[PDB]
Amino acid sequence: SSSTPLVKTSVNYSYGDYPLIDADPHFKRVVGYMRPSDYGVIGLATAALPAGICFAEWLDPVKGKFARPSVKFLRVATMLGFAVGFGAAYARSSLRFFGVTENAREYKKDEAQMAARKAAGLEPYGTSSLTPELQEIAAKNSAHSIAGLFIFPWFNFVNHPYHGREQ
Amino acid sequence: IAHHVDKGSLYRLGPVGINRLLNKASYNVINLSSNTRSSLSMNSMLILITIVSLLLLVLVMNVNFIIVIPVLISILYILFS
Amino acid sequence: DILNEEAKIVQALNNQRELTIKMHELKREEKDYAHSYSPLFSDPVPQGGSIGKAPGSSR
Amino acid sequence: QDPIPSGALGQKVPHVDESHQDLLFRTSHMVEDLETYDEDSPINTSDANT
Amino acid sequence: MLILAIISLITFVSMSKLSDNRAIIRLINIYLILVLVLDSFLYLLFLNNQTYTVMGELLIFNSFTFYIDMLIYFIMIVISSLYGYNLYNNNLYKTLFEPKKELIILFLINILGALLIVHSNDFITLFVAIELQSYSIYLITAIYNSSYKASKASMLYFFMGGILSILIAYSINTYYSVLNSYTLHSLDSLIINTLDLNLILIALSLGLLFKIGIAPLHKWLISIYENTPILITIYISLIPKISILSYLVLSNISINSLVISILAILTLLVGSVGGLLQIKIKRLLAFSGLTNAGYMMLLLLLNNNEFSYLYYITQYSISHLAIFMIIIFSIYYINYINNQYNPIIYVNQLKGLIHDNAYLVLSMAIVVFSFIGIPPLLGFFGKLNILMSILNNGYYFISIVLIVASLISALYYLYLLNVSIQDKNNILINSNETVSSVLSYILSSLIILITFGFIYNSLIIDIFNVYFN
Amino acid sequence: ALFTSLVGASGLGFATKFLSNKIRLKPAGYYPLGYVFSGVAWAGLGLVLHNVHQHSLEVLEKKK
Amino acid sequence: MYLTYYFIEITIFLAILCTIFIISAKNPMVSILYMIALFVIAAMYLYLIGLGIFSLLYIMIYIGAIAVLFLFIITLLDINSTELSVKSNIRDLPLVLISLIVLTISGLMIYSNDSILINKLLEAFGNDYNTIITQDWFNIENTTLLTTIGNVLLTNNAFILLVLAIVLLLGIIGPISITMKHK
Amino acid sequence: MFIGTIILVLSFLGFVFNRRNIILAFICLETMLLGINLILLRNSVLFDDISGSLFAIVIIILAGVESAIGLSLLVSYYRLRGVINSYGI
């Protein structure tokens, strides 16, 4: 009842050297586990877009003479830079769930958090307000969508029961 | 030999006959789309002939392959000359 | 001292020849459904379209 | 300023001056290549929407 | 991240003035650069040819498609730098090379439609994405609407794209009438034996291919490429080719195709002998696209063609992009500028180019010997690796016709050189204004990839061995 | 070697800056600091490509 | 009772007839009015087959938006037209007849899978067997057809609805961006 | 399949042999799209699925946006030339 996957699923099917954590991590868990180097990548991309526009005018200016770009463009450069930094951030942090980069830091967190949900007597991946067919369809939509991050942003917000793991 | 063979006939299989062959063939395939006043009706009737003619070729072709070789030689003759 | 440096190069080229013949065999080898389709959801079995579903429609 | 322009097969090709856009050159009969008289040039337009 | 760019962008362009348009494109240029740099690492997902299917049997993501994705972003970074940067600061070049307000909108919507084909598993994803990119080429053609030729070309392209969209749709529904299925994943090599899916899959392939410029129906595309202006046409030439071909190379539905083999022979013939006695540079330059799209139709007949394809893709894209960028630079040196949208047309207009900016002729030479297939250049290994796939797999008459077509097509390639290295009476001695540093660095970078890009052939193959096998 | 790949990719960058100066009808050493800029950029592309090839060889070693 | 049998065939004949008045009509907008009649014949066939939902979607969308757009164009724009003279299209008539025969037969060909070409065509005509409709009591709610479309456009193919939103966006942006003349 | 194939083929030949105006070419395109619809909707009814009806309801919208885009292309074509030719573009 709202916990049966009713599917057949690959089990611990590692995508690289290292063991997987999830087949798609929820958005909340990805934002929870990201490293300080990841917030550094976010800050790098927030700083790189307005500095990039001011640089690319200093190479060859628009009106023949060098002026600084208006604040109207620097505001949108900051916004789209935070967008690039967050996309790179989410993609980096989801790679560690898939086991394709080093995740020895995050794997201990997941031993601890899956052991804490067993002690608190609740579902291993969340009670969600969806029928199990809608959970399955919703996470067939959200499975492995970090590939194709170039075309479209897509994320996981459904608490569905399968993540490519035993028990 | 220095006139009728060396400069005469070895250039007709060489660079002086290939220029005339390619001149004629290119003139034909450029004037293939020449005649019509409207480009739209010409191209819209040229999309029809192909999906007609390709289909008829494949009808001829699964029966016997020998009877479709001269058809393609003649289509090349009419397209390029 | 020159015949040995012959043989080192010929060994290093027969290594590349065997490397190529292997990597050409590795392409035509068939591949699992978990590797050549989605890894998650490794079954091809559908169970698709379940709202007014009839028992006995499984096989 | 060549004596004879070339055309990749040794043919004679027209050198395109400003003098190819007149009324007799307008609406000639030809393939879409080797043709002068463009429809868009600042002597053929001549206040095209006024 | 194209979606976020489009959603942010069209709201942002609605509020900017006309004079801001140029600088907007500069922003988007840098945006796409940081989608290459800061987001490349997703190649780590695709080890050992691991393929993903995303959104539920809808989009297929392998690393073939990841490379096509990266190639399309790189060429857009180039094309966007061509619109967004001045050539010179004259009163002339401001009214010749000027972007419209909504130009970058249609650019990014077009790239979206071109990526949703190569990534596509379903047929309705295929159909919706072909329709999206077909609308975008309609509107990119018609956006410079104060031109007689561009409007006539947009109408011609509308009707000839409508026919070959309804032929694709008829082939999809014909395939559905015999199989309750949308994927070519259902085919799985047993069904093709006991089912006559020849005529269906071949008609689907054709209706996809005639939009490229395959040769029974090639005249209308050469007319659109001559009628459109000089900046619109380096985009609408490149994008439907690489998108539709890397769809059809990925899904192998025409193998032992006798019809694709006839049309490949006919393409290599009437492309090489088509563009011989021609005097307009975009014509000459658009029959080079017909032959080089002929070399792809060969690879459709192949099984396992992902090396020859991708290498010859990025070959043709760099060579393509460079030879169009060179004749942008020759416009300063011509003695006659007509036709504001299309300022250089006739190929004799670049005649004294060696006496004025001789290294533009060094550039032009290096890219045009690469179209011929000269071995120190990158075009030769592309033709070589096509030949290694053709001769492996039994296509022996196709190979010698390929060679004869390459030899005939070298003539009108070398006509560019013949015209360029000639005497001119009135040579330039000094120029006040010089060419854009960030924009001429792009042409220098595109040459040094063609010249010194045979270096990395070994490295690439080893990388090719890991991620696709 | 890692070092020769760096020096040669920086040489490719020096070639791009040279040819880009000389399309512009400038002298060779017109803006000398841009040689350093382009050389470090193309050297960084050499860094990236060399590290990707390292990792691909290390993946091929683990299949035995 | 058996007067209600040939309806489908009647619509086919009627639909055939309508197309000849589309391609041959002296006035343009009279032929576009015949096209509106052809949409009505299509919606008759779609009710007649069992799809009553679609028929009203055709009358809403095709007749009420696309045809209204077309008539609205023809009003305030200039279009020359020549009549169907015998002298200009009698040269077309033989390629018309050849293409009628070939395209008609070859459209009838791919519904069938014998290797022999003549067996492909005859299976097009062997339909006179009457399908038996059985009552199964397995469904408990009135999921109509439009409900199922709204379940599959929204869960299994939500991305196609979303790429479709990009297409509808493009259909807004495009006509505007052509016909602006900004400043 | 007879009604959809006959509408498609007759509309296709009426499109191809159009020399009289241009709005006949647009409406021959739209009647083609109707014919492809008819063939698919019948195949959905005979196969017991909404699947082809899914492709149908998408291609309805795409035929609509094709009309909107292309008729704005015609207004752009007409803007510079105050008359449309009878023989064609």
Ligand SMILES: CCCCC/C=C/C/C=C/CCCCCCCC(=O)O[C@H](COC(=O)CCCCCCCCCCCCCCC)COP(=O)([O-])OCC[N+](C)(C)C
């Ligand atoms: C910090 C990130 C820097 C951003 C890099 C962005 C690059 C965009 C450019 C795309 C087109 C340019 C050609 C790139 C070739 C990548 C080869 C590769 O490796 O391709 C392989 C196989 O290729 C093929 O089939 C054949 C392609 C052959 C290319 C022919 C051109 C050769 C000359 C240019 C290459 C050498 C220049 C180096 C200069 C120092 C698979 O692709 P992959 O999945 O391994 O992608 C690698 C991920 N990389 C980009 C982040 C490292």
